[PDB]
Design a protein around this nucleic acid. Structure first.
Ligand SMILES: Cc1cn([C@H]2CC[C@@H](COP(=O)(O)OP(=O)(O)OP(=O)(O)O)O2)c(=O)[nH]c1=O
Ligand SMILES: [Mg+2]
Ligand SMILES: [Zn+2]
Length: 1025
DNA sequence: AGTTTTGTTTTTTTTTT
DNA sequence: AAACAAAACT
RNA sequence: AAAAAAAAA
DNA sequence: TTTTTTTTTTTTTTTTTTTTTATAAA
DNA sequence: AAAAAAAAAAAAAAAAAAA
DNA sequence: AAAA
């Protein structure tokens, strides 16, 4: 089976001829005889023909030389068999040399192109470094199956039969009781779209909507069964989009898809931590054609706009703007309520659907869409999509015969997650409506359910009655929907007063009772909340320690090991903070910091101080992660939700509250409280407040009356004003006191405000007028807002809060550090200005794109390298003399610049600089630090000089303690290595116009100095010329 | 007039189902 | 995380 | 070896 | 009820003690 | 020579007792 | 060397 090779798209000739047939095919073909649905499948066949012909001609042509050499050489040696001749043997030798030459040239270029790609990515958070810590990807091979007879069988054809019969049977059985589906849908009250919303679904597709979806398709993904990739559609989007538009307009009119839209390839993926030999334990993922996914993406984007009308906020899975941590914190709050309660009669149940996407009955799903009011061209296209889908299974690389999909949604389709949620929402609305299943009461809140996709947790009171009635409702939903609950995964916590009562209830119900803990959404829920640190955070420390110990000998530098900690450790640490922001002992941070540094410095003491690595400005952009500041950023983030006061955020309302249950609405940018018994038992919210207040006083803010203080605040409510007045202002003028006006501007800011000024209850206005015109009010409200205050007040999205708060916290807590650049200035007798120190820092960032070259420069500036002076102090010895043996004191400036064994190399470099006809003083600050004297500031040759000097640093460092001169030829080899890596990458990026500027002059000089012998031994030849 | 800072856009990996 | 664009301040 | 949402660099 | 005083915890600053054996390439 | 850790002080908040 |  063909697949498009994406490298084939790169090529100028291939693009030109393919782009020519795309135009030619449609202008010839497009006539009344044939529909677009057929015409589109005919086009794809022709286009697949062309690519195979163009591949073959390309691949023949590139060996044409070797064809001619091999025939020509074989002809002369074919004569050599009959008679042996001298001059023929000479020509044979000549041509046979050239054949071996081109064999070598092809081999080297393959190696150098591979190396160049890796040279750009090294030590970067990228696929190579990700793969270094990963194991090998493990192949998709079924060689053993547990058999229907109970036997283990490895006969391949019996494997191919046993798998196919099982997957064919799973999808086969379509329910047929359509009368009962109506009766259940009538039983319960469901939402509906209005006429304006419905018109938004059914509107015509347009060219701008298509190109937007093409631009966003993921690159580097497997194609569908017809073999075309996302990169094809992105490349020819100009020619294709007119014809794609004609296709979708034809599908709207008729509700008929092309035949290829139904095709998909199933690949079987083993589920983690289950027997592979059981056929029961594989996940069938489906590969679909990219044109079919472009249509399905259109439909999913349209329904997603409305989805918050259809789906209650108990469901957070797949929904835009929701967070999984919402359900975690709500659940922990409920468990604490049960722990405190005097009379315990309560149960908490975790439920998962078995094969949730595969068991959805398609007739019930289409009835549900009609019951919500979805009809017209949108419903017509959805019905066409489920009309006859089929799958082929690809086992051991061999493509089996295809079966119909009579049930389920495809797992691998963009439209499947939302359709599943809309069907599950019918059951959720039924459970909430039914009052003989009793929720738990938390002050004024009732909590029955939390959902995350197919994952369900249920909170019940009086379980013997409530649990039986829940099961009966799910039985009835199963009969119509096909939904089924997964008996192996399902667990409960049961709370009762006496052992006898637990014994009886356990006998009734089908569920498995968890004594200590239930794993939930990535974390452990504990039966008592006091256990919460022990079960979640102490394991996480132990798991990070084991993980760094395994990696201890990986072959990367401290630069790469820092990036491993960011990529692998940091995401899981942030996830636990965000789910469970409880108050953590400082020993947690001490253990986490020691472990992480011990890994980065390879169990030897640090070469560069963690203080210096803290700031991006220092050490060339390399920066260490600060775990205490990420913790603080996560804890204070909650205050953004307190200010917003959203009706969806029921997770915030459910903390225990004897005193002042509304207080969190009042805390932020609002007036202080004199009662200080609130949040006495709070797990999360009280600790958030104490962190918020500490940061405000660090900044020297007054947090209590601000440019952002709301009209709906305690300030105005302590004035005794009627709610009709307060809400009138929010409806008419704005949210904040500043929107009203204060002092001189009290209402007079705008004509619409002065028009309002008469509209208020006569007594209220005089009360307001006194407060707004007071002297303290005028000063406090008129000040400029800081950046900290803008984070919590201004932004409408929660997106990216941790990232913003962390960047503020690093400026607020910024420390003093020693500067190595000042110590260099003391080793030389010179002063460096603030402008020089800035130049050294900019050079340390901009010397190269590769981390390999940048690391060398960073190590040199930051005084990384050991010296005899340092070692004499450490070893408590007088033997401070140069390891090379020139007899002088081994200072760092001796080692790099002044040792007579190093000096002949640096004079070589300056002799090249004179051949470039530059002029530069002979001054250690220029090559080592990158600090040039002012006259040279404006020169354009700095990029060339940077490659010359860093090559010299590599040469000296590779022989650091050895009693011999670094040589000019070793320098030339390094400089040529860098030239080769940059050349192939430059062509790949088409940066080649810049590349020729930098290297072209330098390359001519290097080649002039070598002999033909040296050039051959070291393979030094021009890649530009 | 030049340099520095802020914000958006393109590219990586990890978390859940 | 990088680079480019845009606006303000030295 | 595919999909959706979220997070960080 | 309000104000004052004492106790505990956390953060910042300064002093004192200890280190690794060469490096880049891999 | 340089980095890290420990030690000591200072500051604020919380709780109790008296004005 | 640490990708397709
Ligand atoms: C993890 C994962 C999940 N999905 C979707 C589609 C199904 C639902 C539920 O997944 P689940 O693990 O319950 O699997 P399920 O089918 O429910 O099988 P079980 O019977 O629950 O084991 O999420 C997916 O598309 N890709 C994935 O990699
Ligand atoms: Mg499931
Ligand atoms: Zn020396």
């Amino acid at each position: 089976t063909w697949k498009l090779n994406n490298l084939l798209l790169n090529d100028y000739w291939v693009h030109n001829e393919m782009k020519a047939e795309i135009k030619m095919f449609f202008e010839t073909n497009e006539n009344k005889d044939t529909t677009y649905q057929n015409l589109w499948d005919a086009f794809k066949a022709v286009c697949r023909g062309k690519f195979i012909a163009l591949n073959a001609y390309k691949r023949k042509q590139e060996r044409s030389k070797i064809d001619t050499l091999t025939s020509q050489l074989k002809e002369l040696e074919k004569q050599e068999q009959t008679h042996s001749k001298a001059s023929r043997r000479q020509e044979i030798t000549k041509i046979r040399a050239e054949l071996k030459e081109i064999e070598t040239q092809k081999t080297l270029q393959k190696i150098n192109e591979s190396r160049s790609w890796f040279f750009e990515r090294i030590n970067k958070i990228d696929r190579p470094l990700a793969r270094l810590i990963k194991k090998k990807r493990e192949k998709n091979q079924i060689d053993t199956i547990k058999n229907d007879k109970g036997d283990i069988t490895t006969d391949p054809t019996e494997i191919q039969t046993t798998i196919r019969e099982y997957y064919k049977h799973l999808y086969a059985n379509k329910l047929e009781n359509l009368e009962e589906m109506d009766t259940f849908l009538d039983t319960y009250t469901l939402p509906r779209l209005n006429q304006e919303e419905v018109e938004s679904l059914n509107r015509p597709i347009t060219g701008s909507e298509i190109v937007a979806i093409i631009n966003s398709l993921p690159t580097k993904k497997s194609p569908g069964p017809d073999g075309f990739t996302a990169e094809f559609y992105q490349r020819y989007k100009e020619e294709l989009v007119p014809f794609l538009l004609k296709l979708f307009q034809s599908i709207e009119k008729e509700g008929i898809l092309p035949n290829s839209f139904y095709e998909a390839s199933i690949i079987l993926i083993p589920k983690p931590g289950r027997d592979t030999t059981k056929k029961e334990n594989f996940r069938p993922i489906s590969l679909m054609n990219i044109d079919a996914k472009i249509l399905n993406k259109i439909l999913a984007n349209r329904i997603q706009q409305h989805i918050k009308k259809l789906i209650h906020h108990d469901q957070v899975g797949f929904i835009p703007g929701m967070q999984g941590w919402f359900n975690i914190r709500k659940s922990i709050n409920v468990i604490q309520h049960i722990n405190r309660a005097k009379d315990k009669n309560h149960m908490i149940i975790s439920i998962d659907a078995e094969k949730a996407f595969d068991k959805i009955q398609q007739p019930f799903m289409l009835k549900t869409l009609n019951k919500l009011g979805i009809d017209g061209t949108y419903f017509k296209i959805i019905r066409a999509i489920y009309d006859k889908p089929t799958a082929n299974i690809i086992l051991n690389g061999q493509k089996l015969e295809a079966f119909p999909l009579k049930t389920g949604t495809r797992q691998g389709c963009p439209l499947s997650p939302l359709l599943f949620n809309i069907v599950l929402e019918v059951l959720a609305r039924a459970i909430r409506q039914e009052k003989e299943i009793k929720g738990i009461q938390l002050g004024k809140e009732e909590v029955k359910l939390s959902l995350f996709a197919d994952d369900m947790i249920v909170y019940l009171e009086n379980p013997i009655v409530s649990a039986q009635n829940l099961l009966k409702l799910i039985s009835n939903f199963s009969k119509v929907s096909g939904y089924k609950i997964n008996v192996q995964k399902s667990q409960a916590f049961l709370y009762t007063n006496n052992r006898q009562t637990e014994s009886q209830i356990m006998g009734e119900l089908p569920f498995t009772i968890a004594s200590k803990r239930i794993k939930y959404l990535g974390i452990q829920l504990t039966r008592d909340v006091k256990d919460l640190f022990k079960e979640n955070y102490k394991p996480l420390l132990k798991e990070i320690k084991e993980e760094t110990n395994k990696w201890k000998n990986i072959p990367c530098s401290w630069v790469g090991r820092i990036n491993i900690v960011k990529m692998a450790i940091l995401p899981k640490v942030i996830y636990r903070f965000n789910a469970i922001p409880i108050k953590l002992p400082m020993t947690f941070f001490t253990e986490l910091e020691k472990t992480t540094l011990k890994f980065i410095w390879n169990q030897k003491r640090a070469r560069i101080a963690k203080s210096i690595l803290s700031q991006k400005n220092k050490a060339g952009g390399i920066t260490l992660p600060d775990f205490k500041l990420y913790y603080k950023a996560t804890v204070t983030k909650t205050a953004w939700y307190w200010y917003q006061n959203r009706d969806i955020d029921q997770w915030n309302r459910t903390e225990p509250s004897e005193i002042m249950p509304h207080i969190y609405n009042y805390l932020i940018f609002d007036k202080p409280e004199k009662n200080k018994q609130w949040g006495k038992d709070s797990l999360f919210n009280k600790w958030c407040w104490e962190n918020w207040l500490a940061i405000c006083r660090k900044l020297k803010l007054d947090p209590f009356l601000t440019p952002y203080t709301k009209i709906n605040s305690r300030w105005i409510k302590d004035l005794n004003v009627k709610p009709k007045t307060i809400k009138t202002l929010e409806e008419n003028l704005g949210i904040t006191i500043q929107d009203i006006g204060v002092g001189k501007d009290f209402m007079s800011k705008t004509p619409k405000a002065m028009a309002t000024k008469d509209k208020i209850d006569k007594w209220d206005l005089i009360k307001l007028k006194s407060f707004c015109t007071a002297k303290e009010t005028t000063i406090r409200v008129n000040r400029q807002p800081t950046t900290w205050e803008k984070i919590f007040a201004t932004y409408s999205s929660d997106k990216g809060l941790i990232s913003r708060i962390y960047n503020e916290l690093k400026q607020i807590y910024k420390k003093k550090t020693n500067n190595p650049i000042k110590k260099w200035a003391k080793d030389m007798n010179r002063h460096f200005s603030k402008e020089d120190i800035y130049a050294a820092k900019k050079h340390m960032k901009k010397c190269s794109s590769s981390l390999a070259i940048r690391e060398m420069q960073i190590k040199t500036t930051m005084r990384y390298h050991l010296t005899p002076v340092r070692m004499a102090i450490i070893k408590k010895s007088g033997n401070n003399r140069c390891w090379r043996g020139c007899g002088e004191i081994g200072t760092l400036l001796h080692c790099w610049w002044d040792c007579k064994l190093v000096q002949p190399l640096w004079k070589s470099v300056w002799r090249f600089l004179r051949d470039l006809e530059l002029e530069i003083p002979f001054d250690p600050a220029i090559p080592l630090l990158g600090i040039y004297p002012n006259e040279y500031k404006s020169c354009c040759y700095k990029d060339t000089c940077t490659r010359m000097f860093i090559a010299a640093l590599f040469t000296i460092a590779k022989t650091w303690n050895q009693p011999k001169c670094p040589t000019m030829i070793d320098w030339i080899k390094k400089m040529w290595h860098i030239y080769t890596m940059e050349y192939y990458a430059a062509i790949k990026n088409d940066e080649f116009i810049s590349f020729v500027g930098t290297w072209m002059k330098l390359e001519t000089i290097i080649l002039s100095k070598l002999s033909q012998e040296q050039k051959t031994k070291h393979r030094i030849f021009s890649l530009i010329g």
